[PDB]
Design an enzyme around this catalytic site. Sequence first.
Site, PDB file in Angstrom:
ATOM      1  N   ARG A   1       0.812  -1.244  -0.320  1.00  0.00           N
ATOM      2  CA  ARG A   1      -0.121  -0.027  -0.174  1.00  0.00           C
ATOM      3  C   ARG A   1       0.930   1.357  -0.070  1.00  0.00           C
ATOM      4  NH1 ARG A   1      -4.050  -2.857  -2.053  1.00  0.00           N
ATOM      5  NH2 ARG A   1      -4.597  -3.628  -0.120  1.00  0.00           N
TER       6      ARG A   1
HETATM    7  C1  LIG Z   1      -3.442   3.169   1.328  1.00  0.00           C
HETATM    8  C2  LIG Z   1      -4.738   2.497   1.285  1.00  0.00           C
HETATM    9  N1  LIG Z   1      -5.056   1.522   2.854  1.00  0.00           N
HETATM   10  C3  LIG Z   1      -6.060   1.288   3.317  1.00  0.00           C
HETATM   11  C4  LIG Z   1      -6.822  -0.184   2.908  1.00  0.00           C
HETATM   12  C5  LIG Z   1      -7.722  -1.226   2.653  1.00  0.00           C
HETATM   13  O1  LIG Z   1      -7.226  -2.345   1.724  1.00  0.00           O
HETATM   14  P1  LIG Z   1      -6.475  -2.994   3.362  1.00  0.00           P
HETATM   15  O2  LIG Z   1      -6.861  -2.934   4.661  1.00  0.00           O
HETATM   16  O3  LIG Z   1      -6.985  -4.395   2.396  1.00  0.00           O
HETATM   17  O4  LIG Z   1      -4.461  -2.693   2.889  1.00  0.00           O
HETATM   18  C6  LIG Z   1      -6.053   0.477   0.645  1.00  0.00           C
HETATM   19  C7  LIG Z   1      -6.672  -0.696  -0.439  1.00  0.00           C
HETATM   20  O5  LIG Z   1      -5.958  -0.940  -1.704  1.00  0.00           O
HETATM   21  C8  LIG Z   1      -5.015   0.928   0.201  1.00  0.00           C
HETATM   22  O6  LIG Z   1      -5.047   1.568  -0.806  1.00  0.00           O
END
Ligand SMILES: Cc1ncc(COP(=O)(O)O)c(C=O)c1O
Lengths: 209, 209
Positions: free
Chosen positions: B180
């Site tokens: 991310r």
């Molecule tokens: C920067 C960011 N934070 C949080 C998320 C939430 O998804 P995950 O908890 O699966 O990483 C995403 C999803 O793509 C994201 O791009």
Amino acid sequence: EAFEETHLTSLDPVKQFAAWFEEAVQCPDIGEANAMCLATCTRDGKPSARMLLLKGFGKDGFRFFTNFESRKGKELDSNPFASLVFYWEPLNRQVRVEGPVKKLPEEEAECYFHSRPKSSQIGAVVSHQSSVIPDREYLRKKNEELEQLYQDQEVPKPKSWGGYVLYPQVMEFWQGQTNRLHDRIVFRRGLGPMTHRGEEDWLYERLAP
Amino acid sequence: EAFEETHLTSLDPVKQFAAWFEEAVQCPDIGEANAMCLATCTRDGKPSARMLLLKGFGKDGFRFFTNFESRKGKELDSNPFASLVFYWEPLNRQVRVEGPVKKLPEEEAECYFHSRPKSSQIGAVVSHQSSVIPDREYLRKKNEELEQLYQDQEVPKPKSWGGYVLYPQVMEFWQGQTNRLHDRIVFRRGLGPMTHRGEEDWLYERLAP
Ligand SMILES: Cc1ncc(COP(=O)(O)O)c(C=O)c1O
Ligand SMILES: Cc1cc2nc3c(=O)[nH]c(=O)nc-3n(C[C@H](O)[C@H](O)[C@H](O)COP(=O)(O)O)c2cc1C
Ligand SMILES: Cc1cc2nc3c(=O)[nH]c(=O)nc-3n(C[C@H](O)[C@H](O)[C@H](O)COP(=O)(O)O)c2cc1C
Ligand SMILES: Cc1ncc(COP(=O)(O)O)c(C=O)c1O
Ligand code: NA
Ligand code: NA
């Protein structure tokens, strides 16, 4: 096929969402059926929008996780109203959700945060989301250093990181059609001759495309 | 691959958009590369959002066509600020555009309207977009009757139907990445050590993901 009031799965729009969401998930041509656009705005009406993932849904609403100090987090904290768009191109469907937003409990956010892959937890500690940074090497460096710091340790959830739940006040189900004459069935919380009772305090009506 | 300031196609973000848009169009796994989410809001900060098609872009901004009496049209007329999201899942890319909106000239709207398939012109005359209607048969009936009325005739553009152009004040280019830790390069109209000069009055800077 027609999208028709007499062939809805449910007059509870959260269950109708569940029905469409299941079809999206079961479609091989859809990558992330839970991708959605979140629209926020300042109290004096300057709008913003970005893609997010849905991370749970039910009677209390639609949940998602972000940095509270990001641009969306400051808008939500100052002006706790949002809108969601789900667009499933291979099904020719759109779902819109409007409602107020509250922060999720800290213990819920802790639990969700520790369920994430460790690399995503460390990424959240690295990134002061939407703050200005000098270059991409700045992130790569800080990320490698936090990997050292958290070897065999738990990554603490940042105080600024957590979740929101959007309690649905409006839910539109859009089914695309020829001639741009689409099917729109819109639920709102609450009788006119074109207004119909759904489950609980829900009403529904058809909108022109 | 890295998305890097030193390998941008252009420091004019409208030309950078053109470069990414061309790649999207040339990707067989993208259906409508010009699909975008439009976020609007009331002057007192109640946001809304829906899918639209982009229908032209250049130095003066991003153009789209709708019914001015729809829910978005009343918001834009009362509060002429919007945001756009382009999401190209197979390229792991997102583009965000923020700016003020003006109505396009009537003669431009006439020209675009008559370039549309006749069935879409008649659909626009049928539909008082976002008004409450009784059932889908109401649209089917009125549409068949307008087909009779306009046999061998020009369909007049409705007074309520036309276009808008969003003049870009902010343009974000988002390239997805592992952990991310995404690449975000954001142009804004206008110097800090992390702020860089683009073309014309543009500045650009990297944001944390
Ligand atoms: C920067 C960011 N934070 C949080 C998320 C939430 O998804 P995950 O908890 O699966 O990483 C995403 C999803 O793509 C994201 O791009
Ligand atoms: C498909 C997709 C899913 C995303 N999911 C999230 C997410 O759940 N939470 C998040 O904070 N950002 C997510 N992002 C990143 C956001 O689009 C955005 O870059 C970030 O949240 C900052 O937005 P802001 O500057 O408006 O606060 C995702 C991006 C994409 C393309
Ligand atoms: C991919 C896609 C493209 C669309 N393009 C447009 C369009 O260009 N103009 C338009 O008025 N509606 C378009 N629609 C319909 C809108 O999503 C929406 O139903 C309609 O504009 C009414 O929105 P409002 O009630 O917020 O005014 C499109 C829908 C989809 C799914
Ligand atoms: C209701 C409606 N109006 C207008 C448009 C603009 O596209 P076009 O001019 O190609 O019909 C669309 C696009 O799908 C639409 O759904
Ligand atoms: Na299914
Ligand atoms: Na190409």
